[PDB]
Amino acid sequence: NSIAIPTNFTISVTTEIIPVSMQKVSVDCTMYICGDSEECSNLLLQYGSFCTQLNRALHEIAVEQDKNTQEVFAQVKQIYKTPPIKDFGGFNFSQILPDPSKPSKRSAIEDLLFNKVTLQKFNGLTVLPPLLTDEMIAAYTSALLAGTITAGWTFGAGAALQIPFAMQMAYRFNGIGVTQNVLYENQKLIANQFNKAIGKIQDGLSSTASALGKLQDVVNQNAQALNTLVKQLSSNFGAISSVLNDILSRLDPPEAEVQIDRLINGRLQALNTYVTQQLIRAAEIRASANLAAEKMSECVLGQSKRVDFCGKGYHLMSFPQSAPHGVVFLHVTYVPTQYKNFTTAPAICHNGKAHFPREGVFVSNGTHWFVTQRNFYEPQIITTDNTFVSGDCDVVIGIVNNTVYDPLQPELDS
Amino acid sequence: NGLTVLPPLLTDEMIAAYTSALLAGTITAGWTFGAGAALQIPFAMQMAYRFNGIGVTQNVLYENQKLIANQFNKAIGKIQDGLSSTASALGKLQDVVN
Amino acid sequence: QALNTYVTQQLIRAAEIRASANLAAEKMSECVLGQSKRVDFCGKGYHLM
Amino acid sequence: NSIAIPTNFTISVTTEIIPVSMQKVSVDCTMYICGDSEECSNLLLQYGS
Amino acid sequence: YQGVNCTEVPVANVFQTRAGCLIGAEHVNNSYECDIPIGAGICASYQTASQSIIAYTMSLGEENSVAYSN
Numbered sequence A: 001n002s003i004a005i006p007t008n009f010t011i012s013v014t015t016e017i018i019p020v021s022m023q024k025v026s027v028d029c030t031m032y033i034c035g036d037s038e039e040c041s042n043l044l045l046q047y048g049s050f051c052t053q054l055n056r057a058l059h060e061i062a063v064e065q066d067k068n069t070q071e072v073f074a075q076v077k078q079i080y081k082t083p084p085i086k087d088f089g090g091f092n093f094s095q096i097l098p099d100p101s102k103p104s105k106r107s108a109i110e111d112l113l114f115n116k117v118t119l120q121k122f123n124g125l126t127v128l129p130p131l132l133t134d135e136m137i138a139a140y141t142s143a144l145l146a147g148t149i150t151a152g153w154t155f156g157a158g159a160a161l162q163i164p165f166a167m168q169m170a171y172r173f174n175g176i177g178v179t180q181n182v183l184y185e186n187q188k189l190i191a192n193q194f195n196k197a198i199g200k201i202q203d204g205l206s207s208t209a210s211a212l213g214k215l216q217d218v219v220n221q222n223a224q225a226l227n228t229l230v231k232q233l234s235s236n237f238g239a240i241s242s243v244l245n246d247i248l249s250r251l252d253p254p255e256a257e258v259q260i261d262r263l264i265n266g267r268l269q270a271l272n273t274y275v276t277q278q279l280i281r282a283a284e285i286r287a288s289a290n291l292a293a294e295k296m297s298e299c300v301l302g303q304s305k306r307v308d309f310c311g312k313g314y315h316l317m318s319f320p321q322s323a324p325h326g327v328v329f330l331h332v333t334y335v336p337t338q339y340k341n342f343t344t345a346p347a348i349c350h351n352g353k354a355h356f357p358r359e360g361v362f363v364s365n366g367t368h369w370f371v372t373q374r375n376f377y378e379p380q381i382i383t384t385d386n387t388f389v390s391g392d393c394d395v396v397i398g399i400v401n402n403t404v405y406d407p408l409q410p411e412l413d414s
Numbered sequence B: 001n002g003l004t005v006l007p008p009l010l011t012d013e014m015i016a017a018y019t020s021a022l023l024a025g026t027i028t029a030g031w032t033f034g035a036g037a038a039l040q041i042p043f044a045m046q047m048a049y050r051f052n053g054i055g056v057t058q059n060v061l062y063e064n065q066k067l068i069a070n071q072f073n074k075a076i077g078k079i080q081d082g083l084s085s086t087a088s089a090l091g092k093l094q095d096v097v098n
Numbered sequence C: 001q002a003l004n005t006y007v008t009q010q011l012i013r014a015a016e017i018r019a020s021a022n023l024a025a026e027k028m029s030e031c032v033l034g035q036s037k038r039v040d041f042c043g044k045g046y047h048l049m
Numbered sequence D: 001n002s003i004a005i006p007t008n009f010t011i012s013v014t015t016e017i018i019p020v021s022m023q024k025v026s027v028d029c030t031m032y033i034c035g036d037s038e039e040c041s042n043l044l045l046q047y048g049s
Numbered sequence E: 001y002q003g004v005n006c007t008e009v010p011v012a013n014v015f016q017t018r019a020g021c022l023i024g025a026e027h028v029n030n031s032y033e034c035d036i037p038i039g040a041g042i043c044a045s046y047q048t049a050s051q052s053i054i055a056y057t058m059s060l061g062e063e064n065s066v067a068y069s070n
C-alpha cells in the first residue's frame, strides 16, 4: 500500500552521432598493374574482363554514397527563412541557428564540430568530390530546423502563419501525459533550464574533440586501407625485382615474361582484396544511413512514443546539426525528480458502490484522499465527476471506505 | 598449431546477474524504474495500468484477478513442459555453432 | 588462398550477427522496459509485458 | 447492420530466441602457412603484408 | 575531363568548374532542379538555334514566406 509520485522535473538535452557517407574512390586498373609498360599491357590481355568488373563495382559504390546523402537530407520541399524576430518564449536558439557570414561572437555548433573533426597524381587512383557541397547540407539543415521551429505541427502543407512556441511546447507536454497548465505556470524555469543545458553542451563540445570517434573511425580505416594498397606495390612475390624496367633490362623475354606474370598475379590479388573489403564496408555504411534517415523522419518531424529511441526519458523534440560525413541530433527530454511517498488504494467504497478513477491514482495524505496524475503531484478532491463507477464493494481486494462528493446538492439547495 | 579461441569478456554468471537485476527492477518497481524511487508499486496496479493501455478498463482486471493469475501460471507451466520435452527447440543458435 | 576465403566468410557472418544483435537490443528496450503499440512486434495479440 | 463482440478473454505466453554473439577466434598466420620452418618464412616475407 | 584544369589538357564550350574541365556546355546562372549530375553542386541538362546542353548551379527548392505574430 505504497506509491511514489514525482513533485519536480528537469529538462535534459543529449547528443547523438551517426555516420552517413564515405569517400568516393576510383582506380585505374592498368595504371596500377603495369604502369606504362607495353610488354606488361600486352601480357595483361590474357585475363579477359577483370579491370572492367573492378571499375564497375567502385562506380556503383560511388553512386550509392550520394544516394545515401540525398536520402538522409533532401526531405524538405521548401526553404524557410530564419524569422527576423527572435522573441520566443524565453528560448534563445542563437547557438544552433546560422549566421550569413557568421560575424557574431557566438559560434554555431557547426563550426565546433567541423573543427573537431579536422583536429596521388602519379598513382592509378582517383578521388571524386561529392555532389552536394557543405554549404548545401548546412542550408538543408537550417531550413528544416527553422521550419520545425516556426510552423510547429503545420510544417507540411503549411500556411503563412506562425504557431507560437509555447503552444507547441504545451501540445508536446500533453503528448506525454502532463497537462499544459503545468507548463504555463513555470515556462520561465523551463526556458532557463533549456538554455543552461544548451550552454553546457556547447562548453562540453568545445572542451574536447574525442567525442567524434564514430566519425573518425571511418576516415582512419579508409586511409589505412589505401596506404596498404599503395605499399603493396614494392613486393617481389618471388620475382627477381619489383621494378619492371630492371626485369626487362637484366633478362631476355623468355624469362622476363614469366617474372612479369608473377608480379601481375600478385597485384591482381591485392586489388581484389581491397575491393571486396570496400564493398562490405559500403554495405555497413548504407545500413547506418538508413537508420539515420529513419531517426530524422520519426523524431525531428514529430514526437515518438518508442522507448529509448530518442534518448532517455520522455521525448519532447529534437534538432539536427550537420557534421563531416554524418549528422548530430540534440534530443530534448523530460525527467521527473524529487519523488515522495504516499498510500494508495484501488477503489473507494461509497454507499454500496465502488468508484474507480477516470485517470490517475488514489492517494492519501494520512487524512484526506485525492486523485492525481502519475507524473506530477497535483491532488484534487475526489468528485463524482472524476470517478468511474461500476460494481459493488465485494470482489475488489483492498477497497477502502471513503466519501465521494457531489457539486449538485449544494447548488440545488441554494 | 596456429588456431586459438579466446574467452568472452563477460562470463555466464555476469549475464545471469544482469538479467536477474533487470527483471527484478522491472517487477518490483513499476513505471518508476530508472529513477531511484525505490518504494515498491503493487503488481496489480501495474497490470491495471497495462489493461488501460490496451484499451480495457481496470475494473475488468480487479474483478477477475484470480482467474487471470491462474491462466498466467498455467501458461508458464505449459512453457516449462514444452521446454523439458523437446531439447531441440533452439535451432538458430545451434545452426550458428554448426 | 584458403586463409583468405575463411577470413571473407567470417566477415560476412559477423555482419549478419551484428544486425541480429541490433534487433535484439531494440526489442529489449521497446518491450521489456515499456509497452509497445506496434502490431506483432512483441508476439501475436496485444502486448502486456 | 451486424457486429460481434467478445465476452471472455485469455492470456497467452510465447517465446522467441535471438542470436547475439559468435565464437571468438584468432589464427597464427605465419605458423599456419609455414609450420615453423625458416625456409618457408624467408620466401613468405617477399609477399608483403 | 575530371580533376583537370583547362589551361593544359584541352591544348594537349571550354569552361572551368570545380569538377574539372567541361567541354560543350553553355554556362548560365539561373538555377534549376538537378537533371544530370556532374559534381560539386554542378548539374547539367538539355534545354531548348542553339538547342544545347546547359550547365548551372543546382537549386535546393523554392522559398516560403510566413507571417509573424505572437
Ligand SMILES: *[C@@H]1O[C@H](CO)[C@@H](O[C@@H]2O[C@H](CO)[C@@H](O[C@@H]3O[C@H](CO)[C@@H](O)[C@H](O)[C@@H]3O)[C@H](O)[C@H]2NC(C)=O)[C@H](O)[C@H]1NC(C)=O
Pocket (backbone or CB within 6 Å): A092, A094, A095, A105, A106, A195, A198, A199
Ligand atoms: C541566449 O540568448 C542571448 C540573446 O538573447 C545571448 O546573449 C548574448 O550572449 C553573447 C555571448 O554569450 C554576449 O556577448 C558577450 O557579452 C559580454 C557582456 O559583457 C561581453 O563582455 C563579451 O565580450 C561578449 O560580447 C552578448 O552580450 C549577449 N547579449 C545579450 C543581449 O544578452 C546568450 O549568449 C544566449 N545564451 C548562450 C548560452 O549563448
Ligand SMILES: *[C@@H]1O[C@H](CO)[C@@H](O[C@@H]2O[C@H](CO)[C@@H](O)[C@H](O)[C@H]2NC(C)=O)[C@H](O)[C@H]1NC(C)=O
Pocket (backbone or CB within 6 Å): A008, A009, A010, A337, A338
Ligand atoms: C524543484 O522545485 C523547486 C520549487 O518547488 C525549485 O526551487 C527553486 O529553484 C530555483 C533554481 O533556479 C531557485 O532559484 C529557487 O530559489 C528555488 N526555490 C525554492 C522555493 O526552492 C527547484 O529548482 C526544483 N528542482 C529543480 C531541479 O529545478
Ligand SMILES: *[C@@H]1O[C@H](CO)[C@@H](O[C@@H]2O[C@H](CO)[C@@H](O)[C@H](O)[C@H]2NC(C)=O)[C@H](O)[C@H]1NC(C)=O
Pocket (backbone or CB within 6 Å): A349, A401
Ligand atoms: C467500511 O467498510 C466495511 C467493509 O468490510 C464495512 O464493514 C461491514 O459493514 C456492514 C454494515 O455496513 C456490517 O454488517 C459488516 O459486519 C461489516 N464487516 C466488517 C468486517 O466490519 C463497514 O461498515 C464500513 N464502514 C461504514 C461506516 O459503513
Ligand SMILES: *[C@@H]1O[C@H](CO)[C@@H](O[C@@H]2O[C@H](CO)[C@@H](O)[C@H](O)[C@H]2NC(C)=O)[C@H](O)[C@H]1NC(C)=O
Pocket (backbone or CB within 6 Å): D007, D008, D009
Ligand atoms: C470465460 O470467462 C468465464 C468467466 O465469466 C468463465 O467462466 C468460469 O470459468 C471457470 C474456468 O474456466 C470455471 O471454473 C467456472 O465455473 C466458470 N464460471 C461460470 C459461471 O461458468 C469461462 O470458463 C471462460 N471460458 C473459458 C474457455 O475458460
Ligand SMILES: *[C@@H]1O[C@H](CO)[C@@H](O)[C@H](O)[C@H]1NC(C)=O
Pocket (backbone or CB within 6 Å): A004, A339, A340, A341, B037, B038, B039
Ligand atoms: C517513504 O517513507 C518510508 C518510510 O517512512 C521510506 O522507507 C521510503 O523510502 C520513503 N519514500 C521514498 C521515496 O524515499
Ligand SMILES: *[C@@H]1O[C@H](CO)[C@@H](O)[C@H](O)[C@H]1NC(C)=O
Pocket (backbone or CB within 6 Å): A365, A366, A367, A368
Ligand atoms: C494532507 O493535505 C490535505 C490537503 O492539502 C490537508 O487537509 C491535510 O491536513 C493534510 N494531512 C495532514 C496530516 O496534515
Ligand SMILES: *[C@@H]1O[C@H](CO)[C@@H](O)[C@H](O)[C@H]1NC(C)=O
Pocket (backbone or CB within 6 Å): E003, E004, E005, E006, E007, E016, E017, E018, E019, E020
Ligand atoms: C588550375 O590550375 C591550378 C594551378 O596548379 C590548380 O591549382 C587548379 O587545381 C586547377 N584547376 C582545377 C579545377 O583543377
Ligand SMILES: *[C@@H]1O[C@H](CO)[C@@H](O)[C@H](O)[C@H]1NC(C)=O
Pocket (backbone or CB within 6 Å): E029
Ligand atoms: C548572370 O550572368 C550575366 C552574365 O553572364 C550577368 O550579366 C548577370 O548579372 C548574372 N546574374 C546573376 C544573378 O548572377
Ligand SMILES: *[C@@H]1O[C@H](CO)[C@@H](O)[C@H](O)[C@H]1NC(C)=O
Pocket (backbone or CB within 6 Å): A087, E069, E070
Ligand atoms: C508579440 O508581438 C506583439 C505585437 O505583434 C506584442 O504586442 C507582444 O508583446 C509580443 N509577445 C511577446 C511575448 O513578446
